[PDB]
């Protein structure tokens, strides 16, 4: 035992990754299933993503935050606030309402846990009220990623914590779809979990692909260091 929380120790290394994801959209239902690592002492994450059942009825980039934010770095400093970390090897339930400004939105639940040596997230989306040809159905957004300052604050009833974010979507014709996210996350475990004060994550991401894959598939890279305190 040689850390504030004893999830912390879990994440001193590269920890493999699976993503398990089950989605309709307007109707089209979709799997996609990722596998990769993370090293949270550099806040780093590599992943691959494959289509595996249905048409991908969504852009790729739609997707990146709703398919592990216990690799973030956190600097010695704010040891503290690491609830993500604190609530693992149990996990903990990461609730979204993702709203797309003047289009439709994504509601999803994912389990995010240790599966034996691996970290596993698996996720439920339901996507409803889309237009036809919109932004997300007439993938009209660039295969790109932006910078993002993600807030954080305890829940003051529930032992976890509300997340609230604007992921900002590049258009093909150079403007920007906004998705506005509300986010809550509760620990799966009985165990005591970090109740943190007010920080947020700054995210940066690349989108890629493999061009030894035909599948349709989205290659990632990720940094995020918690900040704030």
Not at 85 to 98: D, F, H, L, N, W
Request: proline share 4%; net charge negative.
């Amino acid at each position: 035992d040689k850390m504030v929380s004893k999830g912390e120790e879990l994440f001193t290394g590269v920890v493999p990754i699976l993503v398990e994801l089950d989605g309709d959209v307007n109707g089209h239902k979709f799997s996609v299933s990722g596998e990769g690592e993370g090293d949270a002492t550099y806040g780093k994450l590599t992943l691959k993503f494959i289509l595996t059942t249905g048409k991908l009825p969504v852009p790729w980039p739609t997707l990146v935050t709703t398919l592990v934010q216990c690799f973030s770095r956190y600097p010695d400093h704010m040891k503290q606030h690491d609830f993500f970390k604190s609530a693992m090897p149990e996990g903990y339930v990461q609730e979204r309402t993702i709203f797309f400004k003047d289009d439709g939105n994504y509601k999803t639940r994912a389990e995010v846990k240790f599966e034996g040596d691996t970290l596993v997230n698996r996720i439920e989306l339901k996507g409803i009220d889309f237009k036809e040809d919109g932004n997300i159905l007439g993938h009209k957004l660039e295969y790109n990623y932006n910078c993002h300052n993600v807030y954080i604050m305890a829940d003051k009833q529930k032992n976890g914590i509300k997340v609230n974010f604007k992921i900002r979507h590049n258009i093909e014709d150079g403007s920007v779809q906004l998705a506005d996210h509300y986010q809550q996350n509760t620990p799966i475990g009985d165990g005591p979990v970090l109740l943190p004060d007010n920080h947020y994550l700054s995210t940066q991401s690349a989108l890629s692909k493999d061009p030894n894959e035909k599948r349709d598939h989205m290659v990632l890279l990720e940094f995020v260091t918690a900040a704030g305190i």
